[model samples]
Target chain A: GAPRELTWSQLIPAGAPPAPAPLPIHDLANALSEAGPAASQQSPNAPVVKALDGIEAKLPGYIVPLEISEAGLVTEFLLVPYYGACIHVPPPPSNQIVYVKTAKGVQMDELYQPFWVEGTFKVENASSELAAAGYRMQASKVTPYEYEG
Target chain B: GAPRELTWSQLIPAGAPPAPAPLPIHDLANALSEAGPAASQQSPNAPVVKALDGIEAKLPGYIVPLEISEAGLVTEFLLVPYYGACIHVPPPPSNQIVYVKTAKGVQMDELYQPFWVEGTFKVENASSELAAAGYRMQASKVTPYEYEG
Candidate 1:
């Protein structure tokens, strides 16, 4: 009964596309410090909602790391619902992006802010990592979002 | 001197796009209440930063009305930068969007949150309405949006 939070448009699957508007948990630190390069994804093939894959979700986002151990923490990431999306414009579609992954990673100064995350949701596509996310997640809890309002 | 607060990736121009990072203005009230059927613009035509046209800007965002009046107020909108962008998925690129207008309007419950508009910015495009914004603004001021941190 605790895992039904989900809601990035419900991972969009009623016919695919259209769904993603109800976002405002805010506090993405500074989005991306004004990035100025990457800006491509809008829906890299968009389409996922296979019944929410394995289930047990919970969500909320804004990470974007994509692997980074050596102590910088992070350990692969993508989350993203807003806050400068994939580091600029054009992102947000590939099912609003998920692709989490986390073997207890988390810390590059907590990667700005916004979090929550839980686990098991995988629709998968990952696009070899770094972008095209149709939804994925190995996260088992990541916390720090807060809103509730 | 107070009208130089810009920032939304400085309204993109140094080559356009790839410039919307440093965001985090927050308090969008609640993005768009879970839109679900609007999504369809990642960059409407993109490109507009003609040296910032008329200048005297100021910025911050989230307000998507498009004209309300009658007593509800609002008076044309579209300032974006986050918060369910144009109502879901793709949106944010037409130079980060801005179209504003205001003859003193602004209530409809203040259209959710995030404001601080100011005046003169123009780069025009408007695409006739509802969307395609590359910057406009007739507002002389809007207010709200605190943050400071």
Candidate 2:
């Protein structure tokens, strides 16, 4: 009899599991581990620049608090969850948030709401590990929740 | 015996609700209504500037987003639950919220997270409805949320 040909599936056991598919880009977390602590030591005094320059410009995946840092002083602040998330937990990722520095500390009346942030986009690659994006602002204006009413 | 001098306690109704104390400033509502629409319109823009100036020096409360507006091609963003509530709602006479303007369109990642907005404090008596007690930021930098493992 002619040699019988075997298919790959046929050789496997009936209950054998199939290989897993690759994760979607969005599903995958940022590769911060590979970046290592060295990434955190980015030049804090580096000239401020736009991080998203020439990159995709669309609404952020979500807005979250990165950290609070003094303008002239090294970065100093806390990172909180996005909206409701901040109410609980230590905080979310730094990369998925923004750092806002205003001459005056804005007052928060509603615990949950969005704030309008308009400013020049400052990019800091060194702070990438600490934050998904590094940015600073010489805020000219601050507003509070006005949509609820 | 001559009619006993009416005892102060005996003359007063034991159960008569103590004359209602004046409403506390924090408890009052619609306090801004007394200011009238004319006042509301012009107060926010300038007061927002002043409030922001004060807040920049030292933050008093949490930050929240109040409302969004389009004024003659310029977008006005209001932060409420702020010192000035009149601009956000029919604020009380003592209410002082913050209103800010951004030359650039700002994308809020989350719908209910207060951001530290940095900018110049713009006070326009003509735009009193937009006034607030916060600074105005022509934002130069933005950071992302910081996640904890």
Candidate 3:
């Protein structure tokens, strides 16, 4: 499809936070270093990777609404349970989360419907937000219509 | 920074929704066409122009606790109200918004912190979870923070 011509106003709505600063690489690196050896031990290559393995093994078992975008394409999405979830208050540096894209996008009945997706797991670096929240996920199979209307 | 390696399993969490088929464009187009000439006659291009103009005039306004994602960047992030608001139940389709990048990214206190962002607005024809919900915004200036905490 040809890219549609649209005004800036039509492309973006009004009143959103300014674009975020380039991912605070230096700050993030420092934070990662400060987390030290104990954290490093959780590295994917560690010999006793049980803890990390458990998290990964358990990861492919669930999918949330934020994981799916409005168009039904599944991508990493932010998850919050309340009104002031990520804005009104300061989210824990560890509150960051990621939503994995299913093999295919899921058309949803409603925008906010939650569903369960199951598949394999993987650990990867992501945006500062996901890094800050210590979130990661990957899935092979996804079930879209899970919630009961 | 370099692209980080991630496993499929690690990327998607368990129990998430299964993949789904895309909503047919013909279905949507047919629905619009079926609305008939009477609907078009009632509103016509004039109403559309007026509506677009009205939205454009109010481009520099306030929106709260939604998600924003930029492309051509490797990582993605979410903008939310606080910790639990969006993650738990997710925002409405109208809330899956984004801002066009005009200036360098803005600096706010944290992920969910509420702040004022000023900019132009644009609407585009793209199908994604965000667009389905009517997410739109293009930010130029992000102001200082305002928190009720």
Candidate 4:
């Protein structure tokens, strides 16, 4: 099924913290050591846009791997809008994150590039035992993110 | 089952970031409005102590309600070492948080008092699709906290 394309702002509810300006995707190698100061940034539990629940949508973001298997596959991750070490920038507000789980995981080697995740997007709240803000995507497809010319 | 008591320090893995000094439990009402600079505090993806996994343990902390039922029951919450608003202090590193879910949740008015959560404590990682750091508890009990003086 064709899904609606979503930008980061759509993830935030009206009257919520405005989405932070997009930052440069950091060099994953160097970002780790220099993660100071960034961690001090407060990450408010911004509210999610309730209207987005259960929508089939495609959103693009850098995948911050949370669970990786021995085969170097990322089966679970937080889909964040910017690419930087979580240490460098406070992880985005809960609303800005999309917790994605996939059976056929992405390889560790492919993480350097941002990806588009297409699947069902739902505003899973406290009921899901996740943070207060954020969407949960049962992603059916993951592809290299390329801007339409 | 008699569960072992765990301190917030035990949640930190060897060589992980040292736990922050315990701060006063902020007044939930006013803390919301004054939660400005505190949010700027950075929260790194601190590592959790793997050795503590699957332990039946009792831990104490302030409950920050994530999901509240219409009956004013808190079914899901992040148990943190300190009680200041997430806005005032950056939420603790993931390792310092215990994501708790219970069939019987604590009442809303009861949140002001810190509580002891007891049950099966597990180091639920990416397999659980939660943040990189943190513990998950299938809470068997939630009771008002009293230090063993």
- Number of the top candidate by TM-score? 4
lDDT of 2 by residue, A43-125 (tens): 22322223343232212111343433454332222222223322311223333334545554443333233344333333433
Calculate each model's fnat, 2 decimals. 0.05, 0.10, 0.19, 0.00
| Residue A103 alpha-carbon offset, candidate 1, angstroms | 18
Q: Individual DockQ of the candidates?
A: 0.03, 0.05, 0.10, 0.02
Worst 10 residues of 4 chain A by lDDT: A125-134
Error of 4 at A76 (Å): 30
lDDT of 3 at A34: 79
By summed lDDT, the worst window of 10 consecutive residues in model 2 chain A runs over A19-28
Against the hidden reference, what TM-scores do the models get? 0.32, 0.27, 0.32, 0.42
Taking chain A of model 3 alone, its TM-score versus the true chain A equals 0.38
Give the range of the ten consecutive residues with the poorest summed lDDT in model 3 chain A: A41-50
Q: Write the per-residue lDDT of candidate 4 for residues A5-99, one digit (tens) a residue.
A: 99988877777778654453556324633664333233445677888888899999887655544333567667878776242344566777888
lDDT of each: 0.65, 0.31, 0.32, 0.68
Model 2 segments beyond 4 Å from truth? A1-149, B1-27, B30-75, B79-98, B120-135, B142-149
Which candidate leads in lDDT?
A: 4
After superposing candidate 1 on the true structure, give the runs of residues whose Cα lies further than 4 Å from its correct spot. Answer: A1-80, A83-91, A99-114, A118-133, A142-149, B1-10, B15-61, B64-78, B84-101, B108-136, B139-149
The reply for model 4, stretches above 4 Å from the true place, is A1-149, B22-41, B126-133, B147-149
Can you write out model 3's per-residue Cα lDDT over A1-149, one digit (the tens) per residue?
22222121221124422222223357654664577433421222211111332142222122223443443344554332222223332222222233354556543222344444444433343343322333344654445335455
Expressed as tens digits, the lDDT of each residue in B1-149 for candidate 1 is 45766777667767655633222112221332233223245357777678888888878777878678887888888888666554433356677788888888888774544667888888878863346777788888887654221
The full ranking of all candidates by lDDT, starting with the best, is 4, 1, 3, 2
